[PDB]
Amino acid sequence: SANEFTLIGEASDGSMKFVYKEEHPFEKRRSEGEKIRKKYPDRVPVIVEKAPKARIGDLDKKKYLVPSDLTVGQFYFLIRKRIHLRAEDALFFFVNNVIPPTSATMGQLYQEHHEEDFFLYIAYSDE
Amino acid sequence: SANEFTLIGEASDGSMKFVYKEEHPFEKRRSEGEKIRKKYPDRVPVIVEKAPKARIGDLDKKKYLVPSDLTVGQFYFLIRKRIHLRAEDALFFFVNNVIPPTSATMGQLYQEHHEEDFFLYIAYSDE
Amino acid sequence: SANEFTLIGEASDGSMKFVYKEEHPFEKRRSEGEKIRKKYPDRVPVIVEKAPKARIGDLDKKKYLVPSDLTVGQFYFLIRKRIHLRAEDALFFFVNNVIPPTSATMGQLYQEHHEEDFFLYIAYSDE
């Protein structure tokens, strides 16, 4: 197909703003994250939000406390069941605009990417 | 959701006991694993068992001889077809209580994790 | 199952020949790949072909221009939708006969594996 290409996929705009951070002042989030990490050191606190452009279902709950040794892939299935995804619908997680390996553990992601309020922030989208 | 978290996922209990090892004495397993590795050096012998708590189907066969360059992900699909998983059901593999990368090859997992009887042991579960 | 193994999976024959290369002389491919990489440096040109033995659907288009920061896993879903895979059908990508990690980016694969005509070649199969 001479000079012909099919342009597919979109470069991430990196513009994911979490509503959680707009609705809860930093000092309140940090106090809470610090406390929950002290109380439950084998668990990590995670905020999960849908990317605004995503056309899949929203979550009822956004604050999760998950085992540090749980993988991304296990978390994927737990979240997918909560939004009732059509069988053929894709679901991707983004941490700081990057999709993590599905065998990474939630503790590993948290250690590397948690924010200064001691939460790990994950966005999800359908593309 | 003030002080509110949804607790999801379970920390692995690491208590996976393989029935294969309870039914076949170590020396018989080792003799067999040694022999099959000598005869078929480009293949690895694998014991696959369902985690007792898993509510998905059991396998008819547990002893597999697989190409060393086959990936975990290819193996996943071969095993999934054998238990007739509902489309939305999850399937996870565990080697020594850890989920391997799906692009790892069976030979790589075997080299790192085979037991002293020269078998690689994989447990599977739905969570 | 004494002396009994179930032999499953197939060792890759590494014999994937791309029709694209048989139909377009090297110098024409290189000129084009060089030009498109100069013009669109944040995108990578990819040739996608079905492995001849695969019993899944063929693609209408084989020449794609994809964002460098798109993952393999995102690309998987874009290609899967284009061939209308039955829900339970597997789809695997091979670059130089090896399945890449699904979290690798297309730019990372391109940097490591592009050919001298400046295209990245991906084969897909159902096993």
Q: What residue spans define the domains of chain B?
A: 1-127
Nearest one of C112, C109, C82, C93 to A8, comparing CA atoms: C82
DSSP code, position C90: -
Q: Which residues of C touch B (CB under 8 A)?
A: 1, 3-12, 87-88, 90, 92, 99-102, 127
What is the chain A residue with the closest CA to C36? A3
Say yes or no for a CB contact (<8 Å) between C87 and A88. yes
Helix axes of B72-83 and B106-113: crossing angle, nearest 10 degrees: 100
Measured CA to CA, the distance from residue B122 to residue B79 in angstroms comes to 11
Instruction: Using CB atoms, pick whichever of C3, C10, C99 lies closest to residue B71.
Output: C99
Q: Rg (Cα) of chain B, in Å, rounded?
A: 16
Measured CA to CA, the distance from residue A124 to residue A122 in angstroms comes to 7
Block residue for tokens 């690309």: C75
Which subunits count as partners of chain A given 3+ CB pairs below 8 Å? B, C
Instruction: Using CB atoms, pick whichever of C10, C90, C102 lies closest to residue B67.
Output: C10
> In Å, what is the CA distance from B9 to each residue of A32, A71, A78, B16?
21, 10, 8, 18
Sign of CA dihedral B56, B62, B68, B70: negative
DSSP code, position B100: P
Distance from CA of C126 to the nearest CA of B (A): 9
Measured CA to CA, the distance from residue B58 to residue A92 in angstroms comes to 30
Measured CA to CA, the distance from residue B127 to residue C41 in angstroms comes to 42
Nearest one of B48, B43, B121, B120 to B80, comparing CA atoms: B48
Measured CA to CA, the distance from residue A82 to residue B54 in angstroms comes to 20
Over the range A91-101, which residues count as b (16 or more CB within 10 Å of their CB) and which as e? bbbbbeeebbb
Instruction: Using CB atoms, pick whichever of C87, C92, C102 lies closest to residue B74.
Output: C92
* Residue B111, φ and ψ in degrees, nearest 5: -60, -35
Chain B residues touching residue A69 (CB < 8 angstroms) = 11-12
Asked whether the beta carbons of B74 and C93 are under 8 A apart, the reply is no
Measured CA to CA, the distance from residue B100 to residue B94 in angstroms comes to 7
Nearest one of C78, C59, C62 to C29, comparing CA atoms: C62
Q: C49 CB contacts (<8 Å, ≥6 apart)? A: C16, C18, C19, C20, C59, C62, C121, C122, C123, C124
Say yes or no for a CB contact (<8 Å) between B64 and C5. yes
Which of A44, A63, A99, A120 to mutate to test binding with chain B, by most B CBs within 10 Å of its CB?
A63
Q: Count of CB atoms within 10 A of residue A39's CB?
A: 9
Measured CA to CA, the distance from residue C62 to residue C50 in angstroms comes to 9
Helix (H) or strand (E) segment spanning residue B79: helix B72-83
Furthest C-alpha separation in chain B = 63
Measured CA to CA, the distance from residue B50 to residue B43 in angstroms comes to 22
Q: A5 CB contacts (<8 Å, ≥6 apart)? A: C36, C45, C63, C64, C65
Tokens representing residue A114 in the block: 């948690």
Chains A, B: CB contacts within 8 A come to: 57
Which of C19, C35, C74, C102 to mutate to test binding with chain A, by most A CBs within 10 Å of its CB?
C74
According to CATH, the topology of domain B1-127 is Ubiquitin-like (UB roll) (3.10.20)
Asked whether the beta carbons of B33 and B119 are under 8 A apart, the reply is yes
Tokens representing residue A101 in the block: 């390996």
Block residue for tokens 């999760």: A64
Measured CA to CA, the distance from residue A104 to residue B101 in angstroms comes to 8
Q: CA torsion, points A113, C72, B91, C80, in degrees to nearest 10? A: 140
Say yes or no for a CB contact (<8 Å) between B127 and A67. no
* Residue A59, φ and ψ in degrees, nearest 5: -85, 145
Q: In what side-by-side order are the strands of the sheet with C6-7?
A: B92-94, B120-125, B43-50, B63-67, C6-7
> In Å, what is the CA distance from C48 to each residue of B63, B111, C41, C60, C83?
36, 32, 20, 10, 12
